[PDB]
Design a protein around this ligand. Structure first.
Ligand code: CHL
Ligand code: CLA
Ligand code: CLA
Ligand code: CLA
Ligand code: CLA
Ligand code: CLA
Ligand code: CLA
Ligand code: CLA
Ligand code: BCR
Ligand code: LMT
Ligand code: PQN
Ligand code: SF4
Ligand code: CA
Lengths: 733, 183, 74, 198, 74, 37, 80
């Protein structure tokens, strides 16, 4: 009979097989495919889901704060943040034997604990947290915020509180409020916290809710701000002998732009970060008054889009009708948001390792490596999702009649040229990068290392020289002492920036050579190939020569059968599917390069990387084989240490990856026949045929098989690299 | 009917039927009559609470209490603040739920089950306009009390006497500029 | 540098260029830009309170930027 | 017909046919008619057990006998291993006879006696009094365990300590103060939440 | 070679056929399209190529490892 | 203070690991196989 | 159940009906082609979705299309 689950799909509820549960779980968030769904109901469900997501995020943050305040060593880590390892949380496992108990008992705790690698200790220490009471109060506050967000999500679904469809389409009002309030006012408030709490707490002065109304952030007290003498806030900054957390060497300035890093914490100045947030707050608030909402002044995005067509007709109709195809399509907005968020996540990773913002973050090698790898993998997944949603937009929301002659239609008009050129770029990069690598490998194998091709990256070195690095000797722009660009910043920020960039002990514009050139080309190959697969799948989503009516089958369908030569993996979903492997490979190459260069930097031997990164054998032996010795020795027949959990996780990831290869290689048919034999065996077995199944056992579908195999592949990939990176970086240092 | 801006016509959603209707709604928060009447009740009760708060602060200062109005929370009292919060929440929940349910039956204020709570008569539309205007003045006065205590650290009557003693000085300019001297 | 003089002059200058110079261009661009409140004013040129706030905001930003640069002593 | 707050509404399945109805079912677990009878019987037996347990705990503190949470550790004139075997052996037959009573009649019973009332005061008003007293005793037992968890000592001792300083000795000034205060405020806001949406 | 096998074993010929269509378009633009129409490998051929490369890569890996180790230490 | 007792992990870890997932799995299993009227 | 549709480009070659392994299609009289016949799908409740009919269609593009829809015991080809 018809089952209750899933309530959103009547066709799935009538399915008498096990496929009903799987499809009900995988199509729960596809509100557009639900039964009796309207546009207004769609937007309302997304609103409630957004509130629930915020509730989960805030609860997770409160949980991290609570566990650090309860089972951590934050009160002891602030005293000696160079020789004390941060504690994530305690370990309570009845499966642990005695050696595992004393092995994980470290960091000054009274029992087995986990050493945190997220870097929340440095972040909380920099923003002003000093005691466990502060973390406890922050945890309770975030839990209350999470409960409020959850209640808001439940409340916006009840009658008299459901927003209308017209409210969700007010793009001008939403953009104005997000730029001025969500971005500008939030940044201004963060500036207020840095000026009022973080900066005085870094100078040994406690400023909490009990005394912030009686403690002045500056000795002049708002007089220079109102009189326009803003330069008075940059007078007397922290000297080079300032000790973080104490008043020794501290200054009085609150808004500076010294640049560079703090001599002790090796991080950005707090006054510089406060000034940064103040400037971007003013800029975002000003930008929040651009669109017309209810007072006559402002813009209409439709007018700006319609008045942006070239006169010669190079772009056809230009952007006519682009306002309606974006405002009425949620997949277009989701794709734009994911593309921007993925790029910003990558930007965060690069800027965070190169310019550490938190105190004593550069010394924590494990934290730096884990944070960079985490943000780069998150960025790669988000980028793949952006392109997948672009393909979904082409299939479900693109209207050729409304987008007639504009840039959107012209993209599909010459999609063959785009795919062909992406293919050519990827082919050239792959052929040459692989050829140079194999050539260097043959030269190193034959005992002639002077015969390998080592192309110097003169363009990137030229840019590094433009930033102030005098190692290469170009002597121009910031590298030349007689340039206008150099002389115009010598009194504001160039001294600190130049001192930091010319220091070879940090990660600020590291020295590069032929190995960096080759790996950068490998990165370019990965980016271009992943882009080729994603772009080709989005452009061919509506159809191709093999499947002229692909848009009539949806975004995800198994195939079109073995006819016409065979149509396996013809849908756009399959294109995203194949692109996830390339994304994992690209992020693997970038994280491998980052980890090896930083490992050789921290070990004090950059020549090892410079001489072994030019051939793949050096990558396999000097980086993968050499750095995994301590990892695989976490547990051996002679005993175990605290690094055994990473060894177990290493083997765990290998097992999950290999398990994924099963769903990836073997296909449905074999499993369906095997399941039929199992059905016969259960039906003909006494004492067991009395227990019957409620859902008919069937093999996983083709699409489900691909998703399951990719999920196992990605999980094994991530867990294996995370275990190796954390174990190698923590054991070495 | 005079409006807030000279030469500005009052909006269509705002009609002189309400008590203090002066055609002031640049943001257009009272487009529908449902939200308009709910906001009217919200304005009346906000003004009532502000009237009682301003009267209490002025009475506390006039009677010479030891702590200022912004320190009464931390003052020692029998049945500490940790125990006063649940009692207040329970009684306020009962009183407010009775007030809200009485508002659904009839569009007027009340007290538990007296809707409208009007003993001894003396009710008229002019009195309603006076109530709304006094509530608005009390709300603005309470915000003035808060910002005055923040920037000058002086109580309302004390700050008023300080301003009367020296008019050309001891104002927003002096207090905003001579901020370190005040602390 | 007198802050009051600089702020007052910048605000008055921006209000003057917004009322006598760029008012026609802004009105032509606002009408061609195609619930609301009509902020009718007795100004013969139609310069309402919203325009006053916008031009005053621009003048204040310019004046404070000038004061800030002059305060930097460079 | 009073409800669980001044102005509630029955959730379309608590019209009032059952005794002690107040329209309290936010989780809507009694939506099924078959589950309503079983849940009612479970509530009645839980209430009876809580009634006897609360009376027993209150009587032990007056005489001076060991505390209810430490009476098990005391050594009696028997073996705990034999006590558990006898307890499950007797209760197997007792619960089996009680379950068969509910299938034939629908209420509780003792052994082979479904309407167990040797005196005979089984009235409609008496059935509702049993439910009210059982609910009160369930809350009382939860209070006994919670008071012994944070304060220890005992129920009678807890009441005696509360009379010494009622404004300073309460759940809000104890170790679970802020949690219960926030919960009380949320609960006080709850009827307005339900009335605002409806 | 072994990793190369994973390209044929985890993909389908529909994607490759459409990619070939775009490459054929680029060839037709420059009048270099072959008379023999380029078609992607069949489903069976894709599986055969993948298993052949998988076996060759794995067995050759074990062969190189075994021979190098046993010749150097044995 | 918000500090949990020393015995808090010995009670919450077995709860969240065996009692809560068993109840959740049983309730979810009954809900998935429930037949519509 | 799956959705099987016949289009007007059908030439009435009856190759799709002969290739159907569950008797879903049939031939009905028509006047839009030389063969004076047209394919039809009156028993789509028994269609499994093997797409053999699409493989047997000679028109460009196909005259018969199978869109995988809801799954049941018959559409999944389950003998248990
Ligand atoms: C319903 C409205 C209501 C309002 C508006 C306030 C407002 C206030 N309460 Mg209060 N309370 C209210 C209801 C209630 N309170 C309490 C119980 C308490 C307690 C227990 C305390 C307060 C305190 C405070 C103050 C906290 C402000 C601050 O940042 O202090 C930060 C405090 C400091 C930085 C230290 C003192 C500095 C001071 C000498 C310098 C000047 C301070 C400013 C003039 C404050 C300006 C306040 C404005 C912005 C509202 C503030 C004036 C606190 C207080 O009085 O602190 C002195 C306090 O301890 N309230 C209860 C009982 C449950 C209430 C209702 O039931
Ligand atoms: C000033 C008024 C205001 C404010 C503050 C907000 C705020 C918000 N709105 Mg809202 N909105 C408004 C007006 C406003 N809105 C109006 C007038 C309308 C009607 C036109 C809407 C209609 C609307 C809709 C339809 C939705 C929202 C949503 C949201 C939430 C977005 C969630 C998010 O992305 O996290 C916050 C984002 C940021 C804080 C910006 C981050 C900046 C970059 C990306 C990161 C960089 C910062 C820094 C480097 C990282 C920090 C480092 C460290 C701390 C880790 C957010 C809390 C969504 C929602 O409902 O959620 C429940 C949504 O669906 N709004
Ligand atoms: C703001 C982010 C965002 C949002 C709102 C959406 C929203 C949506 N996506 Mg999308 N997507 C995103 C980002 C996002 N996506 C990203 C980052 C990717 C790249 C990974 C994708 C790739 C993608 C594809 C290919 C598809 C969607 C689809 C969809 C739609 C419905 C499917 C669904 O969610 O059902 C529920 C989703 C699930 C049940 C996910 C399954 C569980 C996954 C595999 C996680 C497994 C992790 C594993 C358990 C870890 C365990 C490890 C541990 C045990 C050791 C929906 C509107 C589908 C669609 O549009 O339908 C046509 C579609 O096919 N997305
Ligand atoms: C190590 C494994 C591996 C390798 C080498 C490749 C290689 C390639 N992939 Mg691929 N891929 C892989 C794994 C791999 N993939 C996996 C696991 C997946 C997920 C299923 C994908 C999914 C995928 C997709 C979806 C796409 C590609 C594409 C491509 C091509 C990109 C163009 C290029 O870089 O030119 C360089 C060429 C090479 C690196 C090939 C090697 C050349 C050999 C070594 C030279 C010949 C040797 C010698 C002269 C003769 C020996 C023969 C002997 C029998 C005599 C390229 C041939 C894209 C494409 O087709 O671009 C147009 C495409 O869209 N891949
Ligand atoms: C390492 C990856 C991997 C794993 C684990 C498996 C596992 C399995 N394969 Mg398989 N296979 C793989 C790779 C893998 N394969 C690949 C890459 C291919 C493509 C060539 C195939 C192709 C293939 C075919 C064609 C067939 C199988 C079959 C089987 C099953 C054999 C039955 C068995 O071994 O009993 C026991 C199961 C195991 C040993 C797997 C590990 C189980 C662990 C050790 C137990 C952990 C239990 C634990 C308590 C769970 C608690 C979890 C907790 C969260 C609650 C088995 C489940 C055959 C089959 O159907 O079965 C008869 C079959 O015909 N595989
Ligand atoms: C707007 C509501 C309001 C609120 C929240 C307060 C709150 C407070 N008043 Mg107050 N008061 C109010 C209105 C209000 N008053 C009004 C309208 C007047 C008449 C002008 C007064 C006159 C007044 C005096 C004379 C005193 C207080 C005092 C107090 C404080 C302790 C009194 C108490 O609760 O003891 C118990 C409550 C009852 C027994 C009932 C307390 C913070 C005392 C104080 O200043 O503390 C230092 C005090 O001396 N009030
Ligand atoms: C998402 C945040 C988060 C995460 C990932 C964890 C993770 C963990 N907690 Mg913790 N906890 C949290 C929040 C979090 N907690 C908060 C906010 C509190 C304050 C109330 C606590 C209080 C707490 C205590 C007292 C203890 C733990 C313990 C533990 C560990 C044992 C496993 C466990 O779940 O115990 C149980 C965790 C809880 C009972 C807290 C959950 C309470 C929240 C409000 C409910 C969350 C609902 C959830 C989001 C819904 C999704 C779950 C599922 C339906 C999908 C584990 C590492 C134990 C430990 O330390 O082991 C050594 C332990 O004793 N936690
Ligand atoms: C995540 C939560 C979790 C927790 C808290 C435990 C806890 C425990 N596990 Mg277990 N386990 C888990 C997950 C978990 N496991 C998972 C996911 C797997 C699959 C990978 C396993 C696989 C596993 C195996 C193979 C074994 C254990 C064993 C044990 C016990 C350790 C034996 C011991 O030294 O103490 C001493 C043990 C005792 C004093 C006996 C206590 C008997 C039970 C626990 C008490 C009575 C049961 C209780 C009343 C009813 C609970 C049911 C409930 C869900 C409704 C211990 C109580 C071992 C074991 O069971 O011991 C025989 C063992 O062999 N676990
Ligand atoms: C498919 C599709 C789509 C699309 C997507 C995309 C588009 C993606 C991508 C991509 C990306 C991801 C992009 C990005 C980019 C970037 C850029 C474009 C940039 C730039 C730059 C600049 C301009 C800079 C400059 C400079 C320098 C050089 C340095 C210093 C500073 C300065 C500023 C000077 C959508 C969804 C829409 C829908 C439809 C479909
Ligand atoms: C921090 C938040 C959590 C604590 C919440 C405190 C209780 C809040 C209750 C939920 C909010 C209710 O909020 C308020 O509800 C009332 C009562 O229905 C609604 O008012 C409604 O009834 C009035 C009565 O005539 C109608 O005129 C009106 O058209 C209608 O909207 C308001 O539009 C809404 O602003
Ligand atoms: C890459 C790939 C292809 C594309 C593979 C192709 C097109 C084979 C390429 C082989 C050669 C390069 C084709 C041309 C051979 C010429 C004879 C070479 C002439 C060049 C001179 C130098 C001799 C599939 O067709 C396929 C099908 C099914 C599952 C997976 C896949 C798959 O992974
Ligand atoms: S195979 Fe195609 S052309 Fe032939 S009868 Fe069937 S639908 Fe018509
Ligand atoms: Ca502090």
């Amino acid at each position: 009979a018809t089952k209750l689950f899933p309530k959103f799909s009547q066709g799935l509820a009538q399915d008498p097989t096990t496929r009903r549960i799987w499809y009900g779980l995988a199509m729960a968030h596809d509100f557009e495919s639900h039964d009796g769904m309207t546009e207004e109901n769609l937007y309302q469900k997304i609103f409630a889901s957004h509130f629930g997501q915020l509730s989960i995020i805030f609860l997770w943050t409160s949980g991290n704060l609570f566990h650090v305040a309860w089972q951590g060593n934050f009160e002891q880590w602030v005293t000696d943040p160079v020789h004390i390892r941060p504690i994530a949380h305690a370990i309570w496992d009845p499966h642990f034997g005695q050696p595992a108990v004393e092995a994980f008992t470290r960091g000054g705790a009274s029992g087995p604990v986990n050493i945190s690698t997220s870097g929340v200790y440095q972040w909380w220490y920099t923003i002003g947290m000093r005691t466990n009471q502060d973390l406890y109060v922050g945890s309770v506050f975030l839990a209350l915020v999470s409960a409020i967000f959850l209640f808001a999500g439940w409340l916006h679904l009840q009658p008299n509180f459901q927003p209308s469809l017209s409210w969700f389409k007010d793009a001008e009002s939403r953009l104005n409020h997000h730029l001025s309030g969500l971005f500008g006012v939030s940044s201004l408030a963060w500036t207020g916290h840095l000026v009022h709490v973080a900066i005085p707490e870094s100078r040994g002065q406690h400023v909490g809710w009990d005394n912030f109304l009686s403690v002045l952030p500056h000795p002049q007290g708002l007089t220079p701000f109102f009189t326009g003498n803003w330069a008075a806030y940059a007078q007397s900054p922290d000297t080079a002998s300032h000790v973080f957390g104490t008043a020794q060497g501290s200054g009085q300035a609150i808004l500076t732009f010294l640049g560079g890093f703090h001599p002790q914490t090796q991080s950005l100045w707090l006054t510089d970060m406060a000034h940064h947030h103040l400037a971007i707050a003013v800029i975002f608030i000003v930008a929040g008054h651009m669109y017309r909402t209810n007072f006559g002044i402002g813009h209409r995005m439709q007018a700006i889009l319609e008045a942006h067509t070239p006169p010669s007709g190079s772009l056809g109709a230009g952007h006519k009708g682009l306002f309606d195809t974006v405002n009425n399509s949620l997949h277009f907005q989701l794709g734009l948001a994911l593309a921007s968020v993925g790029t910003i996540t990558s930007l965060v990773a690069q800027h965070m390792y190169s310019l550490p913002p938190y105190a004593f973050q550069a010394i924590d090698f494990t934290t730096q490596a884990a944070l960079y790898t985490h943000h780069q993998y998150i960025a790669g997944f988000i980028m793949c999702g952006a392109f997948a949603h672009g393909a979904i937009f082409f299939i479900r929301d693109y209207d050729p009649e409304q987008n007639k002659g504009n840039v959107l239609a012209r993209m599909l008009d010459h999609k063959e040229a785009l795919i062909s050129h992406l293919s050519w770029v990827s082919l050239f990069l792959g052929f040459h990068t692989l050829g140079l690598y194999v050539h260097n490998d043959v030269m190193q194998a034959f005992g002639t290392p002077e015969k390998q091709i080592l192309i110097e990256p003169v363009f990137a070195q030229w840019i590094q020289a433009a930033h102030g690095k005098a190692l290469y000797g170009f002597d121009f722009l910031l590298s030349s002492k007689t340039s206008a660009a150099f002389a115009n910043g010598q009194s504001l920020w160039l001294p600190g920036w130049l001192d930091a960039i010319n220091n070879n002990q940090n990660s600020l514009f590291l020295t590069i050579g032929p190995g960096d050139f080759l790996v950068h080309h490998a990165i370019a190959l990965g980016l271009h190939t992943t882009t080729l697969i994603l772009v080709k799948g989005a452009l061919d989503a509506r159809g191709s020569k093999l499947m002229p009516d692909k848009k009539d089958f949806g975004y995800s369908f198994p195939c079109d059968g073995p006819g016409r030569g065979g149509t396996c993996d013809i849908s756009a979903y399959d294109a995203f599917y194949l692109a996830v492997f390339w994304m994992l490979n690209t992020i693997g190459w970038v994280t491998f390069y980052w980890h090896w260069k930083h490992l050789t930097l921290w070990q004090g031997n950059v020549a090892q990387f410079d001489e072994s990164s030019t051939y793949l054998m050096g990558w396999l032996r000097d980086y993968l084989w050499l750095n995994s010795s301590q990892l695989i020795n976490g547990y051996n027949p002679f005993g175990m240490n605290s690094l055994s959990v990473w060894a177990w996780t290493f083997l765990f990831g290998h097992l999950i990856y290999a398990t994924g290869f099963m769903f990836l290689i073997s296909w449905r048919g074999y499993w369906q026949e095997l399941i039929e034999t199992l059905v016969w065996a259960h039906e003909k077995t006494p004492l067991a045929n009395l227990v019957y199944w409620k859902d008919k056992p069937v093999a996983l579908s083709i699409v489900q098989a691909r998703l399951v195999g990719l999920a196992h592949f990605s999980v094994g990939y991530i867990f294996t690299y995370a275990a190796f990176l954390i174990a190698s970086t923590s054991g070495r240092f | 009917r005079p409006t807030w801006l000279p030469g500005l016509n009052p909006p269509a959603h705002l009609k002189g039927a309400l008590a203090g209707d002066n055609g002031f709604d640049p943001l257009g928060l009272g487009q529908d009559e449902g939200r308009l009447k709910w906001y009217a009740e919200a304005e009346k009760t906000n003004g009532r609470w502000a009237m009682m708060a301003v009267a209490g602060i002025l009475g506390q200062e006039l009677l010479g209490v030891t702590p200022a109005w912004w320190e009464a929370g931390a003052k020692e009292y029998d049945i500490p603040a940790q125990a006063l919060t649940p009692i207040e929440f329970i009684v306020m929940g009962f009183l407010e739920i009775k007030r809200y349910q009485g508002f659904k039956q009839t569009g007027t204020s009340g007290f538990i089950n007296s809707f409208p709570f009007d003993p001894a008569g003396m009710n008229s539309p002019s009195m309603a306009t006076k109530e709304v205007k006094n509530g608005r003045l009390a709300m603005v006065a309470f915000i003035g009390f808060c910002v005055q205590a923040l920037a000058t650290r002086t109580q309302p009557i004390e700050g008023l006497t300080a301003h009367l003693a020296d008019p050309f000085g001891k104002n927003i300019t002096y207090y905003l500029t001579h901020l370190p001297e005040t602390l | 540098l007198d802050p009051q003089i600089v702020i007052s002059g910048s605000t008055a200058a921006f209000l003057a260029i917004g009322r006598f110079v760029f008012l026609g261009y802004q009105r032509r661009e606002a009408n061609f830009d195609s619930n609301s409140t009509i902020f009718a004013t007795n100004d013969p040129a139609g310069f309402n309170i919203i325009d006053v706030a916008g031009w005053g905001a621009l003048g204040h930003a310019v004046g404070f930027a000038v004061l800030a640069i002059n305060s930097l002593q460079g | 017909r009073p409800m669980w707050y001044p102005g509630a509404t029955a959730p379309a399945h608590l019209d009032g046919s059952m005794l002690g109805d107040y329209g309290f079912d936010p989780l809507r677990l009694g939506v099924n008619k078959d589950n309503l009878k079983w849940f009612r019987e479970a509530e009645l037996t839980n209430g009876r057990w809580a009634m006897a347990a609360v009376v027993g705990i209150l009587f032990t503190d007056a005489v001076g006998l060991p505390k209810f949470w430490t009476a098990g550790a005391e050594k009696y004139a028997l073996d705990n291993q034999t006590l558990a075997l006898i307890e499950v052996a007797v209760f197997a037959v007792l619960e089996g006879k009680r379950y068969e009573i509910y299938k034939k009649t629908g209420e509780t019973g003792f052994l082979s006696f479904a309407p167990f009332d040797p005196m005979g005061m089984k009235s409609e008003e008496m059935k509702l009094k049993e439910l009210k007293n059982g609910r009160l005793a369930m809350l009382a037992f939860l209070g006994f365990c919670s008071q012994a968890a944070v304060y220890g000592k005992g129920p009678i001792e807890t009441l005696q300590l509360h009379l010494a300083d009622p404004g300073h000795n309460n759940i809000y000034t104890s170790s679970v103060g802020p949690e219960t205060a926030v919960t009380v405020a949320v609960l006080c806001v709850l009827p307005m939440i339900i009335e605002a949406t409806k | 070679v072994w990793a190369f096998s994973l390209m044929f074993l985890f993909s389908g010929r529909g994607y490759w056929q459409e990619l070939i269509e775009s490459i054929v378009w680029a060839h037709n633009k420059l009048k270099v399209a072959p008379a023999i129409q380029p078609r992607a490998l069949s489903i069976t051929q894709g599986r055969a190529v993948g298993v052949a490369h998988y076996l060759l890569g794995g067995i050759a890996t074990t062969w190189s490892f075994f021979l190098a180790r046993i010749i150097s230490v044995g | 203070p918000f500090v949990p007792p020393s015995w808090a992990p010995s009670v919450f870890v077995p709860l969240t690991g065996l009692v809560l997932p068993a109840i959740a799995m049983a309730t979810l299993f009954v809900y998935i196989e429930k037949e519509a009227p | 159940a799956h959705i099987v549709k016949i289009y007007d480009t059908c030439i009435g070659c009856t190759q799709c009906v002969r290739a159907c392994p569950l008797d879903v299609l049939e031939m009905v009289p028509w006047d839009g082609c030389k063969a004076s016949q047209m394919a039809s799908a009156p028993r789509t409740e028994d269609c499994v979705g093997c797409k053999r009919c699409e493989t047997a269609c000679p028109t460009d593009f196909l005259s018969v299309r199978v869109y995988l829809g809801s799954e049941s015991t018959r559409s999944m080809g389950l003998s248990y």
